[PDB]
C-alpha cells in the first residue's frame, strides 16, 4: 500500500470519498419494514409477465 491503493486513477493525496454540496432537497423517502398486503392492484410484472409465457411475444414492449 502507498498513500493510495494500486489504483492510481484521478487521485490527489487523501479524501473522505467525496463531499461538500448545498442542501437543495426538503424531506420524503421510501418506507422501510411494513410489507402492507392491503395496497396491491398492480401485481406482478408487465414486461414478460413471468419468465414469458403464452401471450408474451412483443406486444408489451
Amino acid at each position: 500500500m502507498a498513500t493510495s491503493t494500486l489504483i492510481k486513477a484521478i487521485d490527489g493525496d487523501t479524501v473522505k470519498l467525496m463531499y461538500k454540496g448545498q442542501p437543495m432537497t426538503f424531506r420524503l423517502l421510501l418506507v422501510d419494514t411494513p410489507e402492507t398486503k392491503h395496497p396491491k392492484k398492480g401485481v406482478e410484472k408487465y414486461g414478460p409477465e413471468a419468465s414469458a409465457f403464452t401471450k408474451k411475444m412483443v406486444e408489451n414492449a
Binding site: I7, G12, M18, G42
Partner: protein
C-alpha cells in the same frame, strides 16, 4: 373507450396504457412500465403512474413539467401537479384521481395539506415498487431510465441517509468493467463481483466520465479482476457525502488505501 384511470385493470391491456401515457403527458416516447392502483374505503383515490423512457427537457427547467394530472371525482383540476411525488421521484408522470381532496384544490393545498401529504407517501410506495420491479421487469428499461433520470435518484440518499440503502440498491454507477458511458453496474452488481480481501467499495470521483476513462491504470485492475466504480455525476459528490456504507461494506476513495492486503497479510 372510457375514462381509463377509473376503468378496471382486467379490460385495460398494454395497448391502452402505452397509448394513454402519450395522450396525458403530450409526450411520444413509450412508458417502460406503469402502476394502476384503485384505492377506496377511507381515501377514495385511483392512481395511474407511468415511468418515461426519455427525460423531457422540462425535467431540469425552471418551468415545471414533472408530476401527475390532478383529477378530483373524474374532474380535471390541475396538470403537472408534482405535489404527489417529492423532487427525488420527479420522473413519475401520469395522473391521480381523488375524492378526498377538494374540487377547488390549489397547488398550495397539494403541497401543504396533510391528507395530500398521506396521498404523496402512499404513492411513494408505488414508486419504490415500480423502480425495483422495473430492474427485474426488464434490465434494459431500467438502463434507459437511469441514463435519463440518474441525477434525480441521487437527491434521495443525500436527503435521508437512514433508509438510503433502499435507494442505494436502485443507484447505477459506471465502472472499469466496461469503458462505456452507460451506467450499468449498481452497488448490487459490485457486491456480486467482490473478490477475497476486497472489504471496501472502490470509487473514482470525476467531473466527466471521459476524464475518468482517459486514465490507463483502469485496465491494470480489470486485468487483475478488480472493478473500480467510475463516478462522473456532479450531484454524486453530495450523494455519497451521506451514503458512507451499503450492505455492511463501507465505501473507499481511489486517493485512499483499503484492507485488501490485510486479509492476505
Amino acid at each position: 373507450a372510457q375514462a381509463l384511470w377509473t376503468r378496471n385493470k382486467s379490460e385495460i391491456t398494454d395497448e391502452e396504457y402505452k397509448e394513454f401515457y402519450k395522450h396525458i403527458a403530450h409526450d411520444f416516447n413509450d412508458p417502460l412500465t406503469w402502476s394502476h392502483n384503485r384505492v377506496e374505503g377511507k381515501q377514495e383515490y385511483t392512481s395511474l403512474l407511468y415511468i418515461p423512457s426519455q427525460a423531457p427537457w422540462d425535467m431540469w427547467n425552471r418551468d415545471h413539467k414533472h408530476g401527475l394530472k390532478l383529477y378530483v371525482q373524474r374532474v380535471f383540476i390541475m396538470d403537472d401537479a408534482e405535489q404527489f411525488m417529492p423532487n427525488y421521484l420527479r420522473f413519475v408522470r401520469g395522473l391521480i384521481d381523488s375524492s378526498d381532496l377538494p374540487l377547488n384544490v390549489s397547488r398550495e393545498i397539494l403541497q401543504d395539506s396533510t391528507v395530500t401529504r398521506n396521498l404523496r407517501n402512499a404513492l411513494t410506495k408505488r414508486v419504490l415498487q415500480m423502480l425495483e420491479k422495473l430492474a427485474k421487469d426488464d434490465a434494459e428499461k431500467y438502463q434507459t431510465f437511469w441514463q435519463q433520470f440518474g441525477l434525480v435518484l441521487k437527491e434521495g440518499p443525500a436527503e435521508d441517509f437512514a433508509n438510503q440503502e433502499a435507494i442505494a440498491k436502485l443507484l447505477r454507477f459506471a465502472s472499469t468493467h466496461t469503458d462505456s458511458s452507460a451506467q450499468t453496474v449498481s452497488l448490487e452488481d459490485y457486491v456480486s463481483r467482490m473478490k477475497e480481501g476486497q472489504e471496501k467499495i472502490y470509487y473514482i470521483t470525476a467531473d466527466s466520465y471521459a476524464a475518468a476513462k482517459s486514465s490507463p491504470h483502469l485496465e491494470l485492475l480489470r486485468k487483475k479482476g478488480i472493478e473500480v466504480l467510475l463516478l462522473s455525476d456532479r450531484i454524486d459528490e453530495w450523494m455519497m457525502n451521506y451514503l458512507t456504507e451499503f450492505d455492511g461494506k463501507p465505501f473507499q476513495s481511489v486517493s485512499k488505501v483499503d484492507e485488501s492486503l490485510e486479509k492476505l497479510a
